[PDB]
Design a protein around this ligand. Structure first.
Ligand SMILES: Nc1nc2c(ncn2[C@@H]2O[C@H](COP(=O)(O)OP(=O)(O)O)[C@@H](O)[C@H]2O)c(=O)[nH]1
Ligand SMILES: Nc1nc2c(ncn2[C@@H]2O[C@H](COP(=O)(O)OP(=O)(O)O)[C@@H](O)[C@H]2O)c(=O)[nH]1
Ligand SMILES: [Mg+2]
Ligand SMILES: [Mg+2]
Ligand SMILES: [Mg+2]
Lengths: 170, 171
C-alpha cells in the first residue's frame, strides 16, 4: 500500500482553513464556505518522490460533538496551526490551539507548522518578523500562505508531512 | 516570626516585570528602566491578616550567569508569569517560561499566577477570554494588571502568596 499522513487543520474562525484545504484538494478558491462544516479529505500525492495518502481534517471549531473529530484530534500525526495576517486575535489564538493539541495528543512535542494565511492582502496587522519569532519559540516551521493566489498552499502541507517524517526518524 | 514568601517575576522583555515590582515596592511607575538589571526586593506586607515578608526577584532574562538568579529559580516558592496585553509574542512566550520554571524546580506543579500587564492601554492584541483560557488550561489564576495605574498590582502578588498558601495546606 502507501504511507498515510493524518493532518489536522486548526485555527480561529475565518482564517481560511477551508479555503486552504479546498485549494489543495480541489484547486479552487472559495469566496464563501459554510463556517460550521467539518469534513475530511483524502488526496493521493507525490512529496519528494514518495507516493502517499493525505488524510486531512478541516476543523470548524463547533461545540457539537463529533466521533470523527475526536479520532483525528487523538490520532492526528501533524497539525496546521492557521492564523490570518490581518487578524491579530487569530495570531494570539495560536497559543491556545497549541495547548489544545498538546492536551488531545497527550504530548509536549507534536509535528506542527505555523501558517500565516491571507498573504495576498496589502494591509497586515501581523508582520513576518512576529510570525517567524513565534514559530522559532515553538521550534516549528512558518509558512506564509494565500488560499486565493495559491502561494505557499502546497508548501504548508508538504512541510507538515516533512515534519512528521522527521519524527519518524530513528 | 514573619513567614518569608520567595517570589520570582518572569516573562518576555518589555512586559513590565520591573515596573510591576517597582510599583509594588516603591509606589512609583517607571516610564523607562534598565532592561538588563536584575534585583531582589524585600517588603513587609499584611495579606489576609498575616504580617509577612515578600522576597521578590525581578528577573531580566539575561544570558550572563548569576548565582543569585540560580538560587531564586531553584528555591523560589511562587512565580509571576507576566505578558503584555498588547504584545502577542509575550503571551505565546508564557509556555516557555512555565517550562523553564518546571525544569529548575524539577516539578510539574509549582505555585504560579498568569499576569496580563498594561491593562491601562486602550488597544489590546490579547483579549481577557484568551488569557483566562490559557490560565484555565494550566490550572492557575489570571490577574489583569497595570503598573501605570496600579490596577491589580497588589492583587497579582497577593494571589500568588495565596497560591503558595494552598500548596502549604495538609494533603
Ligand atoms: N484575501 C483572502 N481571503 C481569503 C484567503 N483565505 C480565505 N479567505 C476568505 O476568508 C473567508 C473565510 O475563509 P474560510 O476558508 O471559510 O475560513 P475558516 O473558517 O478558517 O475555514 C472567506 O470569505 C474566504 O474566501 C486568502 O488567502 N486571502
Ligand atoms: N502603558 C503601560 N506601560 C507599561 C506598564 N508596565 C510597564 N510599562 C512600560 O513598558 C516598558 C517596559 O517595562 P519594563 O518594566 O522595563 O519591562 P521588563 O523588561 O519586563 O522589566 C517601559 O516603557 C514601561 O514604562 C503598564 O502597566 N502600562
Ligand atoms: Mg471552515
Ligand atoms: Mg479554497
Ligand atoms: Mg526589567
Amino acid at each position: 500500500g502507501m504511507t498515510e499522513y493524518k493532518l489536522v487543520v486548526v485555527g480561529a474562525g475565518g482564517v481560511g482553513k477551508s479555503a486552504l484545504t479546498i485549494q489543495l484538494i480541489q484547486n479552487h478558491f472559495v469566496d464563501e464556505y459554510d463556517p460550521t462544516i467539518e469534513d475530511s479529505y483524502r488526496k493521493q500525492v507525490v512529496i519528494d518522490g514518495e507516493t502517499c495518502l493525505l488524510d486531512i481534517l478541516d476543523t470548524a471549531g463547533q461545540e457539537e460533538y463529533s466521533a470523527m473529530r475526536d479520532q483525528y484530534m487523538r490520532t492526528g500525526e501533524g497539525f496546521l496551526c492557521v492564523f490570518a495576517i490581518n487578524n491579530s486575535k487569530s495570531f494570539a489564538d495560536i497559543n491556545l490551539y497549541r495547548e489544545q493539541i498538546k492536551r488531545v495528543k497527550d504530548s509536549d512535542d507534536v509535528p506542527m507548522v505555523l501558517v500565516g494565511n491571507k498573504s495576498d492582502l496589502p494591509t497586515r496587522t501581523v508582520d513576518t518578523k512576529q510570525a517567524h519569532e513565534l514559530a522559532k519559540s515553538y521550534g516549528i516551521p512558518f509558512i506564509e500562505t494565500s488560499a486565493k493566489t495559491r502561494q505557499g498552499v502546497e508548501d504548508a502541507f508538504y512541510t507538515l508531512v516533512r515534519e512528521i517524517r522527521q519524527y519518524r526518524m530513528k
